[PDB]
Write a protein that binds this ligand. Structure first.
Ligand SMILES: Cc1cc2nc3c(=O)[nH]c(=O)nc-3n(C[C@H](O)[C@H](O)[C@H](O)COP(=O)(O)OP(=O)(O)OC[C@H]3O[C@@H](n4cnc5c(N)ncnc54)[C@H](O)[C@@H]3O)c2cc1C
Ligand SMILES: Cc1cc2nc3c(=O)[nH]c(=O)nc-3n(C[C@H](O)[C@H](O)[C@H](O)COP(=O)(O)OP(=O)(O)OC[C@H]3O[C@@H](n4cnc5c(N)ncnc54)[C@H](O)[C@@H]3O)c2cc1C
Ligand SMILES: CC(=O)O[C@@H](CC[C@H](C)CC[C@H](O)CC[C@H](C)CCNC(=O)[C@H](C)O)C[C@H]1O[C@H](O)[C@@H](C)C(=O)[C@@H]1C
Ligand SMILES: CC(=O)O[C@@H](CC[C@H](C)CC[C@H](O)CC[C@H](C)CCNC(=O)[C@H](C)O)C[C@H]1O[C@H](O)[C@@H](C)C(=O)[C@@H]1C
Ligand SMILES: [Ca+2]
Lengths: 430, 431
């Protein structure tokens, strides 16, 4: 792929935006984004409160310097601060005092499951130094109770996966690492950061630097390789490019792409997802009377039956008032994910509906296999479905494509950023 | 060349000695001399009589974890000794009204005063090991940190390790950076630490049993003299004769006991620096902080604190053992205060222990490493905390390194992190 080629980036989430941003240094880049902003799952909604206007992260919220070095470095270079936002967690179930949390040892569930929490930490710490099973399999295989599976493991895993997810089917190392890196924990609040004035700040900066190259509100309808180059059909027009980089979800990538080949069907067809509803609201009734200063608060509703555990599901609520920059703020600012009961519509600021990728061992395998179509027909692929999960994974896949199309990894000097890049470059087959 | 079935003495029955003896006894005729009336040294568990039974309360060595202490952890596992999590929740109180911070919530005037610096500090410690042979103190000065942060946050939280008498701010930076990046110490969460079931003594009791009458308690070695034939040890008004001698005593003890014509021995063992610690096991509930609720570790600085005189002044750390899981049904207060400044109500004191700890300044580390040039000369060997990395894993693995060197290989080769720790500590000592 020679210099100054005409290149399209389809999808303006984190992966696409970063990929575009880097590519624009060497190539004539156009970036198509379906919705009216840049960031995708990274969205920050303004809330005006008696102490000012605050941008509240509704999808992507959390990362840290160790897990997310490239994103972290990027935030730093753009002069965006961060702050610690510890993952304190409270779980409530139907009965009297049927709770645990990871700040104190109070609650009946904690009492019921403490020995298992204790064992679990040890075993997760011992794993990465020795197992292509799911967390669920592991738990069954190693003597853990069903109460532990569905009253502790599955709710704490909802911090990542949404309360609709079959999180217990997700890959074991994902969970083991989360516990050994103090991201999820039954004994302490996990070490996580947020970005100053919302996650969108970095994306706003990218949007500015890209200028007129960014086509918002322009959903690509299809993408067709030809003998000369690749044609993109978007917004009642046809545009002509030398290369096309996909930064869309596989099921979108597959619908849009229209080729004679059926390996494309073989690879992109079987990706599975999970719906998530993020409801930004001020209805203080969703806070737990027990769950005091806990950032993350899970409630399972009346009617929970352990026998029917796989069908039933709770809601996770985040108390943003516990964040340090919100500590002077007088209005409640809450986000409930996947609420089962409806939220008082007089108190709802806004909803967003999104989907997240399943992370079963098979899905990981499926992601990796996308290397055999990478570069064929002047097509490239980045996004969460090509990488490790989380935002670092998303955006670094963008960087991997840009490196592959000439524009090298911009932080070679940063040892952990570089290693993450090398690792993700190895994960994708690029 | 140390051939099989040689007569070998281990001088000192702390963790290092006991483990070293235990392994050596598989190949050699071992005797282990310990000065005091039990095996373990700083590892001491005192019985306390309570409404739930008899509890063994750790007074010195208390905490470790599977990641930091793989060999110790495996040993407990093989002996069938359980562990439990004992999160390091921390509350700091200073003289004023509400002059506190803690690592469970964001309450307190000191939290308000210092939040920005705690936040920055975590980042910077996480970024360090991926890039610096200075002290934590130097680092803090060099990187713009306030004196309030140095003496009201860093020095108190470092007292969890060093004792409230220590010049902790002069200790090595990587020691601190690692502690923060491994979630051992933290300003935002409770650190991940474990305790052993029925006290730390459990493993040592098991070692004592397996060694049998090879263990001489209450038998302080008076001196150790190499000769042409072997080495003579003078203890308990008698002389015993050995082919080799392994020291598991502190350098200043090792030096007093040892007597040779050589003055490199003086050069190496002479300049080791220590810190006193008083551990007071008691039931005076007045030492608990009215603010500091369910916090395991509670630091108090007394009235009279002057930031300008910060280097002379010092607080006391109190541990609320009633917050530990196995003590949750217990109705009597069980507290340990370390280095109390005010006196503890002697009607409520169960027992005191006075101990000393090694200083961990960059120079002290250098000093430890240099002990390789005397290792094996005159049929003498050296293990213990003064030869190794700090903490119990370091102590006991130094014992294992000597045993490996005297034939008995590292007993946990198939545990990858245990083996790597062994290799690392073998490299640290020059053995
Ligand atoms: C509720 C929620 C919370 C999350 N929280 C976190 C968190 O705290 N931390 C974290 O690390 N990760 C989080 N994630 C993961 C998140 O998916 C990644 O961090 C990252 O944002 C994924 O980026 P992406 O660019 O790969 O996909 P997306 O962010 O979905 O963006 C892809 C873009 O493609 C666009 N698109 C779709 N069809 C078309 C078309 N025809 N034409 C043009 N564009 C199209 C979409 O409109 C979208 O903007 C969260 C996800 C969700 C749903
Ligand atoms: C208060 C305190 C708390 C601590 N807490 C922890 C903790 O929580 N976690 C952790 O990992 N580490 C901790 N340590 C560190 C501790 O030093 C090591 O874990 C380890 O126990 C030191 O082992 P050692 O055998 O090298 O020294 P010691 O355990 O001190 O052993 C030295 C032994 O030599 C003996 N001795 C002295 N003179 C003679 C003589 N003439 N003849 C024979 N024997 C003699 C002593 O009686 C003693 O038994 C703590 C130390 C102290 C003081
Ligand atoms: C090697 C490395 O550094 O990356 C690891 C990935 C660990 C993830 C980055 C941890 C989770 C993400 O950071 C972010 C999840 C985020 C916090 C979602 C938040 N969601 C919500 O708030 C709502 C409730 O849904 C490796 C794992 O990545 C794969 O995706 C995973 C399936 C694995 O098996 C790998 C071991
Ligand atoms: C290789 C490895 O993992 O070990 C690291 C050191 C990590 C320490 C051993 C971590 C803490 C100790 O294990 C535990 C100290 C213990 C909790 C003392 C408790 N004391 C008390 O309770 C009272 C108040 O005195 C490396 C450091 O070891 C060196 O000793 C240190 C001086 C260093 O510079 C190295 C970086
Ligand atoms: Ca009860």
């Amino acid at each position: 792929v020679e210099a100054k080629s005409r290149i399209a980036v389809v999808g303006g989430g984190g992966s696409g935006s970063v990929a575009a941003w880097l590519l624009a240094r060497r190539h004539d880049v156009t970036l198509f984004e379906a919705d009216e902003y840049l960031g995708g799952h990274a969205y920050s909604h303004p809330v005006e409160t008696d102490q000012g206007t605050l941008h509240v992260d509704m999808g992507v919220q959390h990362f840290n310097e160790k897990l997310s070095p490239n994103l972290f470095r990027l935030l730093t270079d753009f002069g965006i601060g961060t702050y610690v936002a510890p993952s304190s967690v409270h779980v409530d179930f139907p009965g009297e005092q049927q709770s645990w949390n990871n700040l104190d040892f109070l609650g009946e569930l904690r009492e019921e499951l403490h020995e298992e929490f204790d064992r679990f930490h040890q075993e997760m710490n011992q794993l990465p130094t020795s197992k292509q099973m799911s967390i669920g399999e592991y738990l069954d295989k190693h003597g853990y109770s069903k109460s532990f599976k569905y009253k502790a493991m599955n709710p704490i895993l909802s911090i990542y996966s949404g309360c609709h997810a079959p999180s217990l089917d997700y890959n074991l190392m994902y969970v083991a690492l989360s516990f050994s890196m103090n991201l999820l924990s039954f004994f302490s609040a996990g070490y996580w950061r947020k970005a100053q004035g919302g996650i969108h700040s970095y994306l706003a900066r990218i949007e500015s630097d890209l200028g007129e190259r960014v086509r918002l509100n322009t959903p690509v309808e299809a993408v067709v390789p030809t003998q000369s180059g690749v044609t993109v059909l978007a917004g009642g027009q046809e545009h002509h490019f030398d290369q096309v980089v996909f930064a869309t979800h596989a099921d979108v990538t597959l619908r849009l792409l229209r080729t004679s080949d059926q390996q494309y069907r073989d690879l992109l067809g079987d990706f599975a997802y999970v719906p998530v509803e993020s409801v930004l609201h001020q209805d203080e009734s969703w806070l737990s009377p027990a769950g005091g200063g806990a950032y993350c608060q899970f409630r399972m509703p009346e009617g929970f039956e352990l026998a029917r555990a796989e069908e039933q599901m709770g809601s996770l609520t985040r108390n943003c008032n516990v964040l340090h920059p919100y500590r002077k703020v007088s209005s409640p600012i809450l986000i409930t994910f996947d609420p089962q009961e409806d939220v008082d519509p007089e108190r709802v600021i806004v909803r967003r509906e999104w989907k997240l990728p399943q992370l079963r061992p098979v899905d990981v395998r499926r992601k990796k296999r996308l290397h055999e179509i990478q570069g064929l027909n002047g097509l490239w692929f980045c996004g969460t479905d090509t990488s490790v999960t989380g935002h670092e994974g998303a955006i670094v896949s963008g960087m991997v494509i840009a490196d592959r199309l000439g524009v090298p990894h911009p932080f070679p000097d940063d040892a952990p950023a570089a290693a993450q890049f090398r690792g993700i470059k190895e994960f994708m087959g690029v």
